Design a protein around this ligand. Structure first.
Ligand SMILES: CCCCCCCCCCCCCCCCCC(=O)O
Length: 268
């Protein structure tokens, strides 16, 4: 007559496999190297080729097409909007989340989505580049660094986080619970029912702790390593939001999608 934490871990894992278009196994199959392989974007010529095949509407404007860096930033935003949608459905699997007031669900998602986005982005990154466009492109790290300022400054800190995060050798069963724990933080600004959220957090962190003990017997500090990664992600998001605001203030063509503007509004 006690909670079955192994079963809860498996429920979370299954919800992650159901709700995210990309997972670490799917990404590794593509990254390893037969139908619809990814188109490699390593320079301006190959960016423009990939756009004409994969996001044709975006470059169908002739002289009116936006600057390459702004088109890339638009594609970044579309990826975030999609991952926010996936995370919102995933959160229903977290015990207690759907029982919270709607406003608290919104606040938890507001602060958690970008931390989760950058954690999961590691799964599609290697030291040379990253998968994009639903696994149909591979854009190089060097190409992103070559963009004009400020756009070359977006992805590099995310690659740096990801190289260390990937060295932990988590699998999707671990990442799903880490993402659930990110969403359940009782210290987000403006929460109403802090007490119930703290209990929700305690519960999911307990599931995570036991799962890591079982799945990674070789790494006895993996749980505190991941607690630190959560703090690192909060700081990565704070810095990312500051850069997005610079882009907003200084780049008139880099229209910010209204869902993301709402996420960033009053965030940090
Ligand atoms: C076919 C053309 C492909 C162009 C691919 C551009 C790269 C996509 C990167 C996806 C990850 C974006 C992470 C940064 C998010 C920045 C925007 C935001 O704040 O939501």
């Amino acid at each position: 007559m006690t909670a079955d934490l192994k079963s809860l871990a498996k429920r979370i894992y299954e919800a992650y496999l159901k709700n995210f278009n990309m997972n670490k196994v799917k990404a590794r199959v593509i990254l390893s190297g037969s139908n619809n392989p990814p188109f490699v974007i390593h320079d301006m010529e190959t960016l423009c080729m990939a756009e004409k095949t994969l996001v044709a509407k975006l470059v169908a404007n002739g002289i009116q097409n936006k600057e390459a860096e702004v088109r890339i930033f638009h594609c970044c935003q579309c990826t975030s909007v999609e991952t926010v949608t996936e995370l919102t459905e995933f959160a229903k699997a977290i015990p207690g989340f759907a029982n919270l007031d709607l406003n608290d669900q919104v606040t938890l998602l507001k602060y958690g989505v970008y931390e989760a986005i950058f954690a999961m982005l590691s799964s599609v990154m290697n030291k040379d580049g990253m998968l994009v466009a639903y696994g149909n492109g591979f854009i190089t790290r060097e190409f992103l660094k070559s963009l004009r300022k400020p756009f070359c400054d977006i992805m590099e800190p995310k690659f740096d986080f990801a190289m260390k995060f990937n060295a932990l050798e988590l699998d999707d069963s671990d990442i799903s619970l880490f993402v659930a724990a990110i969403i359940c933080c009782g210290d987000r600004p403006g929460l109403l029912n802090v007490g119930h959220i703290e209990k929700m957090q305690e519960g999911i962190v307990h599931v995570l702790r036991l799962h890591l003990q079982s799945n990674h017997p070789d790494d006895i500090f993996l749980f505190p390593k991941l607690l630190q990664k959560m703090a690192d992600l909060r700081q990565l998001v704070t810095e990312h939001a500051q850069l997005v605001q610079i882009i907003k203030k200084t780049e008139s063509d880099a229209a910010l999608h209204p869902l993301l503007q709402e996420i960033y509004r009053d965030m940090y």
